[PDB]
Design an enzyme around this catalytic site. Sequence first.
Site, short mmCIF file in Angstrom:
data_model
loop_
_atom_site.label_atom_id
_atom_site.label_comp_id
_atom_site.label_asym_id
_atom_site.label_seq_id
_atom_site.Cartn_x
_atom_site.Cartn_y
_atom_site.Cartn_z
N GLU A 48 0.81 -1.20 0.00
CA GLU A 48 0.00 0.00 0.00
C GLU A 48 0.85 1.26 0.00
OE1 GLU A 48 -3.75 -0.72 0.16
OE2 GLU A 48 -2.50 -2.33 -0.67
N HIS A 96 -14.76 -10.19 -9.13
CA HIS A 96 -14.56 -9.33 -10.29
C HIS A 96 -15.42 -9.71 -11.48
CE1 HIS A 96 -10.83 -9.41 -7.87
NE2 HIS A 96 -10.79 -8.12 -8.12
#
EC number: 3.4.17.23
Length: 597
Positions: A357, A487
Amino acid sequence: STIEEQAKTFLDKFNHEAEDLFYQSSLASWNYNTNITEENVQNMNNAGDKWSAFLKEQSTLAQMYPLQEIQNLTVKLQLQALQQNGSSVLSEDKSKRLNTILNTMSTIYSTGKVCNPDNPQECLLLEPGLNEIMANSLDYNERLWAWESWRSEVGKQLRPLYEEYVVLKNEMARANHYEDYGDYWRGDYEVNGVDGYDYSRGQLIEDVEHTFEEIKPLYEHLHAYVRAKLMNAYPSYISPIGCLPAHLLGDMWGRFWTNLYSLTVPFGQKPNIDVTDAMVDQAWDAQRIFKEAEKFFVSVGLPNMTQGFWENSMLTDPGNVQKAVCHPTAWDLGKGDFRILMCTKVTMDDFLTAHHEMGHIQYDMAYAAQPFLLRNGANEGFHEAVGEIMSLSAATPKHLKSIGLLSPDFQEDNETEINFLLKQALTIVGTLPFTYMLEKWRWMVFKGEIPKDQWMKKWWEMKREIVGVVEPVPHDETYCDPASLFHVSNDYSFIRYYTRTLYQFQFQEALCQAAKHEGPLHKCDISNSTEAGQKLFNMLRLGKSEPWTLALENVVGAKNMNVRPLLNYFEPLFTWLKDQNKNSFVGWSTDWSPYAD
């Protein structure tokens, strides 16, 4: 008094108003996921609807300016995605139907529970429920039940809904002057007007079927190694000649193979690298972990992160007094404001996700000089590629020793790197064929390559052919396998999980060549070398203002996307499985079927 000056002035009124509303909207989403509350849920809903209305107004306003009169590439790029009509191409009934369909998509996924009517005790949730029994199971039927039963209802209640989904989105794409929806998802790697760098949408399939063909050898040996290892767990279930059962690939689908490593270790007696034991006695916490990752970024030239970042990001779970969805995500509120959503814990993985991140953070903060519409990844696979290499430099032993977390007398041998790269390839090499398959399947379905009666026969026929796994039991047309993925159900693009892989290896190769690293690439590192960080930042500030072939040129020097860095990375591993497979069967045959009786 000219179309181009008018377009620039419109872009100024856009970027001077759009950021003030997107800032407010992202603030509402951050507040909701920090405080899971019915007061908070309506806040980010109306915040999102305000921005959805504003972008629709700007979309219907920007189409007055033709793109055939503009000569400035930045203005053309800004107008390209803005003049896109989007969902407005359809009728009111079709729009309401698509929103309802999408609302049902993840509704069935998230609120899909599994239970046993004959065994009340055989009831469990999804996370940390259903994923667990797929993640730490050594039993065969204990996985068969939780694997078929999961798509027994969820993988069935999405088949006709998905059939309606595909035909609505085909008209979604076709009214956009596109061939199919697959050619709409290939629409952001699309580049026009750039001589020598012009990127047609159809060239993606040409690149993908090509680049997969050199991975296919190495992946074939990896599959052979896992299969040769697996009869230790299932000696009465799997033929070493045939393919693998899909329910034994680590989770519901088989995307990540990471949790396969614990049973298919190359060397068990070797004490695995471990610092989980080493922060606890060193009194390390979330604040120190991020402060240390900050030094990693600073060593290569990526500057000090903002003061408000620390006062506004959350690192530790705020107890029970409120709920917060803390999936691993980095949030870009814009306007120079960046906060991170992480349930940090003292472990390499949470340290590795913290670094992953951190890559997103300092990538995002660079292109604040770029306009609002340009403040995005150079492409869709370009964000989970740039923020992941810096994690790959956090888990290296040479880095862990440089920070003292690892033992200064920690020995690395020929049996150490084999275990390390097997763990990484079971995460990075195993995911590539399934990302490729899933998006290829989406492409041959959006193209209408298949009729309804073969909407699944080829799917199993093709994963028995590309990845190398068979079905323990067959499925009928009533089922719908791929929609079980997040997804796929929620209508996201998956190929960003293939392209990011082959982007990050090119990035890491370029950077540790710039650092003049001497040795195998898996031991490369980026820290304490400003010459690779300055190279990376030059691309990083670009954002999307330039195309992705030139972005690849800026760091690597090649407009194309290559496998060569990845095969160079795992060459030490690849040679190893060449030795380990002197007696095993390389290759698969599709005719084998474990239920073929």
